[PDB]
Hints:
The PDB classes it as virus. The structure is cut from a larger assembly and holds chains A and B. Chain A has helices spanning 28-31, 68-76, 127-134, 152-160, 164-167, 186-193, 199-205, 211-214, 216-219, 230-233, 273-290; strands spanning 19-21, 24-26, 36-45, 104-105, 111-112, 171-178, 242-243, 248-249. By secondary structure, chain A is of the alpha+beta class. Chain A has one domain. Chain A starts with 18 loop residues before the first strand and ends with a helix. The chains are: A alpha+beta, B mainly alpha.
Amino acid sequence: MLQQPTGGYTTLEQFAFTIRNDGTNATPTQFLQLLSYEATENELVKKTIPTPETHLPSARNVPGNVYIEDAITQALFGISAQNVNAHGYFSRLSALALPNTSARLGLDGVIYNSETINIPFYDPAAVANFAATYAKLGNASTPRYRADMIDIYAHVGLELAGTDAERAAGVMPVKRAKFDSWEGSLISLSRDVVNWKILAFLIDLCSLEGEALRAFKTRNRDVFRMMLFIMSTAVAANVVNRKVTKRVDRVLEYIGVNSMRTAGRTATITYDLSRHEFAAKFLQLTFTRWN
Amino acid sequence: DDLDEGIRMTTYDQYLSHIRERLHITNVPDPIYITGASTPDQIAASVQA
């Protein structure tokens, strides 16, 4: 029954987000330094983000317990081909949104009906606010509710590849980002970033207050710029790798502009139609909370 | 010593299974949390209820 000192569960060594590359294991901060980019002249301008709709879906009665956490990641950064998922037990979340409920949310990423014996879980009070915002992710494919899978991506590219000199004006030149690679590359970061404990992050966003939110956003603006990069190569138009003499570069076509089908096919992670609606519903919901 | 007295320790899981579902039948407010500060005054007064 862990608690947060307002440092948050992210101020802990229990679960930390680390990519493995370079023959040893490294933190996200060290990785991003390799991403160097130029310009190709198609101005990607920051639009406004429309507020979400308050209505929460109903968690249709369900016996047993689903791994609510699993699906959140298994859709966003899921590597292995994921079939249609617009359907599913994806809104049991809202059953935590009400005041007095007994249903608890454990560590590891499960949603128990009744707290059982020997299972460590997040604090029942700070998991409430996380739900009154993310249980709203249940209606991701209901017509007349789904977000728009175009404009948010403009917001995304201004984040992982936008030098501050640009974001302070709200406009930037479309970039083509290439870092140096190894073998599997793009697919390897996916099989890696999947098992990260995303819930250990999102809970902090909706609780931690201005004192420990300005400090929280400063140490974690990088764990965000990591699960935002992989989520981006699932959109880019090309992945062709340039060649030096012995070196290899993974030029990525157009980060921040959204096409409709993956450049990866075989080389990188791939999305599906049912997932395009999903990524837009996540990316929209999370940005208001972050920004 | 005496192999007795001192303080009585029990694991949280043993508490919830036997004690928590049984004191719950009666209309008594759930056991008070031990204070980070000192409350050697009301420790038994809130335990009295």
